[PDB]
Structure formats: structure tokens, C-alpha cells
Amino acid sequence: VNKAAVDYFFVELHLEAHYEALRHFLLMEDGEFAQSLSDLLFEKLPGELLNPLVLNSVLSKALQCSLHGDTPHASNLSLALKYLPEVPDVLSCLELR
Amino acid sequence: REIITLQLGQCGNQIGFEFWKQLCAEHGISPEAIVEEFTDRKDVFFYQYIPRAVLLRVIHSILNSPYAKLYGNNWASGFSQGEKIHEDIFDIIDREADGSDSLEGFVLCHSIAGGTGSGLGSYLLERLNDRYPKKLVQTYSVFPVQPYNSLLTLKRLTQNADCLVVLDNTALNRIATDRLHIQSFSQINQLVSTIMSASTTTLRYPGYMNNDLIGLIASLIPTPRLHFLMTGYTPLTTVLDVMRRLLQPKNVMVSNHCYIAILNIIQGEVDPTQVHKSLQRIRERKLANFIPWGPASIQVALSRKSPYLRVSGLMMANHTSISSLFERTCRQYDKLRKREDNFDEMDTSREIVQQLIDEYHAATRPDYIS
Amino acid sequence: FEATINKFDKNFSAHLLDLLARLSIYSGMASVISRLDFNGFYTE
Numbered sequence A: 001v002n003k004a005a006v007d008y009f010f011v012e013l014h015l016e017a018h019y020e021a022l023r024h025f026l027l028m029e030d031g032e033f034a035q036s037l038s039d040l041l042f043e044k045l046p047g048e049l050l051n052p053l054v055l056n057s058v059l060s061k062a063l064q065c066s067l068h069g070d071t072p073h074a075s076n077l078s079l080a081l082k083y084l085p086e087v088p089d090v091l092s093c094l095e096l097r
Numbered sequence B: 001r002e003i004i005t006l007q008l009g010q011c012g013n014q015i016g017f018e019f020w021k022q023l024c025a026e027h028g029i030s031p032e033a034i035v036e037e038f039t040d041r042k043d044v045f046f047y048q049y050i051p052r053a054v055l056l057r058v059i060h061s062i063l064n065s066p067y068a069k070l071y072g073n074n075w076a077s078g079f080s081q082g083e084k085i086h087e088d089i090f091d092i093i094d095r096e097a098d099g100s101d102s103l104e105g106f107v108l109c110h111s112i113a114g115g116t117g118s119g120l121g122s123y124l125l126e127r128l129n130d131r132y133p134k135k136l137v138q139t140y141s142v143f144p145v146q147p148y149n150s151l152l153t154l155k156r157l158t159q160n161a162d163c164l165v166v167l168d169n170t171a172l173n174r175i176a177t178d179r180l181h182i183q184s185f186s187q188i189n190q191l192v193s194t195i196m197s198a199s200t201t202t203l204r205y206p207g208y209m210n211n212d213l214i215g216l217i218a219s220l221i222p223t224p225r226l227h228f229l230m231t232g233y234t235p236l237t238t239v240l241d242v243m244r245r246l247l248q249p250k251n252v253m254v255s256n257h258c259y260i261a262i263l264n265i266i267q268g269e270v271d272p273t274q275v276h277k278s279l280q281r282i283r284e285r286k287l288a289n290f291i292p293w294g295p296a297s298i299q300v301a302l303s304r305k306s307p308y309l310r311v312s313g314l315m316m317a318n319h320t321s322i323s324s325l326f327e328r329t330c331r332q333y334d335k336l337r338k339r340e341d342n343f344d345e346m347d348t349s350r351e352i353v354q355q356l357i358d359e360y361h362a363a364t365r366p367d368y369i370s
Numbered sequence C: 001f002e003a004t005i006n007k008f009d010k011n012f013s014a015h016l017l018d019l020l021a022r023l024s025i026y027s028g029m030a031s032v033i034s035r036l037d038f039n040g041f042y043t044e
């Protein structure tokens, strides 16, 4: 049963793909993506850069410049936030789930 | 960010051709510029396939080659011809410039051995700094009245080209007779094209670090003056085998002294767990010497070979021993200065390089600052 | 007449600025502003 349970994951649901895909996006392993996401956000720097009209859309503009992705895996990249910044430091809190 | 190449003279058009053959072989691109059935981003060099080539006699045989579907002897005369076709040739550059999405640099393949291109190379770099001030330029110059045309172009390359990869035919032929046993031109360039191909391994294949041409050059070149590099390519087997065979003067493509920064590119599927171990053994045996003033290190990054085509490796370094090569050249000039409208440009050229030869010899002292 | 053309201006331009004020306050409904003004006009 167990050998048939683990095998069911790889050859049918692509567990080996999800790991080698989340690393392409979260851990920023795939270049031309972090070098295109961070490069866009850093061009701006308050009330701007915080509404879902720019940061929820900068991702859909980022994936096009990735040259790797645009698959069913490539979706589900909710570029959300977890704090409202007021205003030289080295901090810009932002998640990517 | 797109990259575009320019090839001048007889030499540049020859090695650039084989550079286009070897690169076209890396991807599944037929000689007829058509993709066959048979990950790799092929958009930086190719434009939908069409290569961003600019070719300036042998051109006839180049079109006579199966890859047709893939597109005097003085210095002042080479500079004059560049002025007579100033606007005529430049339109090709502009239409290829903005027609491209975002230009990043300008790869220049040319020779300085007294050819019409050697002057032709001097002119283009002056204008490339005139029109586009935000565009990097890289040049893979190659070294051999020959003292004249050589020392002159050095006056332009030290203030226009923000980077440079030197290749001297002398140290190349030593490799030719020893490990290929040729005793021709199309024979040595086989290895030369190999150096350039692997030089852009981190560009055509995406990686984490160094995903752009400014990612490689900004670390090595410390000042806009000390901007000269040398190369190494060992496969001609673990990581400690590669880096140790690279540091030997038998492999360097150049004819106190110490390094400023090294870059080693590994293309194999080697086990990345031992890459730190090889770094320890190189340090403890003290096989290489660095600058004393600032903390200078050696950097390594990994990538993957072309799956269509074994552990390869490239070594890129900025060694102050490159100063000796210039001393060989300029010494010949003074001897030709006493043996043979104003002859004043040749003066400032000899003047400015002697400032560079002073700038290298001053970097090896523990008090290089101020 | 000449005092009526300028009367339409202050009346229409004020009504237009009410639109872009409400079209902008949201979470396309945002790209419409880039269609209304293109020269940075109506930047008030």
C-alpha cells in the first residue's frame, strides 16, 4: 500500500515538479524573475505601491519576463502583503505565498 | 536585455563566424537558421532565427559557406575609411538598436595587428561613447609597423571600452603545437571560439547570480583604468581537479605580481557539496597570491551544459602580470621611434599608456590607496 | 453667447474631474484613466 501510495504521488500528481517549481519562484533560483520583480518594485521608492492595482499586477507583468514558467504551476502566486508601511532603511515587508 | 555583436577586419569576421557555428550548435538550431525537433533562453543573442550580427573579402566565402541563411595596412587609413562611411554604416546600428527591446551591451570582436579593422575598431569606440552613453561595450581584442597599429588602438581601448578580454596569438600557438601538434588560422580559432562560447554560459542559461553582463564585470574591474582581463579553459574528475589545473601558467591565454579577482565558471553536473572543500585546499597550499590591501577573494558559480551536445570549466582573472605584455609593445615603439602632418597623436598615445603601466605597478603595493 | 461657452467649460470640466476621482478609487477599471488622459493632463 505504502509503495503504491508514494508512487501515486510522483507519476500522477507530480510532487517532484512542485518542489523544483516553488524553488524557481520563492527561493528566487530562476534569474530574470527576481532581477525583474525586485527591479520593478525598487523603481518606485506609502499610499501608492500598496493598492491591489499595482502590486497585484506587477507580478502578472513579471512572469512574462521570466522566460520560464507560464504553466499551471506558475499560477497561484498570490503577491500579497502583511503590513501597512507609514514612510533610508533596509526593510520593505512583503510576502509571496 | 539583448546583446549585439560587431566583427571587424579579417580576424574578427573569421573567429566570429566559428563563434556563430559553435553557439548555433549549442542550441537545436540547424545551419539553415531553422529550429529542429530534437529551458535555454535563446532570445539574448537571436531575434525571431536571426542572429544580431554586423559584418564589416572573406565575406564572400562566408556567404558561400552553408551558413548563408544566418544573417590598406596603416592605422590612419583604417581611421579614414571609418570617417568616409560615418552615416552609411551607422544606420544599421540604430535600426538594430531601437528595434531591439532593451540594449545591454556591445560585443566587439576585432584584431589590432595593423589591419584596416584595427583603425576601424578605433573609430567605432569613439562614436559608441558619443551616441549611446548608457550602453556597455565589451571587446575580445587579439594581440600579435605592427608596433605602431598595436600601441595606437590601446589609447582608445583604455578610455572607451569598459572591459576587455586579451588573447595573444603567441601563447595560443604554444598550446597548438603542444596539445594539438599542428607542426593554421582555422586551427587555433577552434579553441578561441570555445573560450567565448563558455564566457557567456551564465547569460544564455538563467542562474541565480550574474544574470546580466553588468553582473560579471562589476566585481572584477575595480577602477575604470585597471580594466583588463585574461581567460582560462581547462578541459582540453572533481572540482579540485578543475581549479588546480586552471591556475597553471601553461593554460593561461597570455604570454611583485598578484591577482585582484578571479571568476571560475563550472558547466558540469558535479556534486556541489565539495566546492567549498576545493576552496580550502587552494587556500592552505597557497597556490595563488592576492592583493594585500583589500580583502580579495575567488568566486565560483554553476550552470548546465547544452543537453544536446564530462566536466568543463572557465577561469576569468584580472592579473597585474598583463602589464608585462604592454612593456614588450611600447619598448618596440621607442626603438622604432629612433629608426623610422604633425605626428602629435602618436605622442599622447604613448603618453597615456605609460600612465596605465604606472597604474598597474602601483596596485601591487600595500599602500595603493592615495 | 461668448459668456455661455466659458460657462460650459467650468461646468463640464468640473463634471469630468468627478469621474476620474471615482474611477481611481478601487482595488480594467484602472487602465481607463490612462485612456482619458495621455499627456499628463488633468493632473489636478
Ligand SMILES: Nc1nc2c(ncn2[C@@H]2O[C@H](COP(=O)(O)OP(=O)(O)O)[C@@H](O)[C@H]2O)c(=O)[nH]1
Binding pocket: B008, B009, B010, B011, B014, B015, B072, B111, B113, B114, B115, B116, B117, B118, B142, B143, B144, B169, B185, B186, B188, B189
Ligand atoms: N588570433 C587570430 N588572428 C588572426 C586570424 N586571422 C588573422 N589574424 C590576424 O590578423 C592580422 C592580419 O590582418 P588583415 O586581415 O590583413 O587586416 P584587414 O586586411 O584590414 O582585415 C594578422 O596579423 C593576424 O595576426 C585568426 O584566425 N586568429
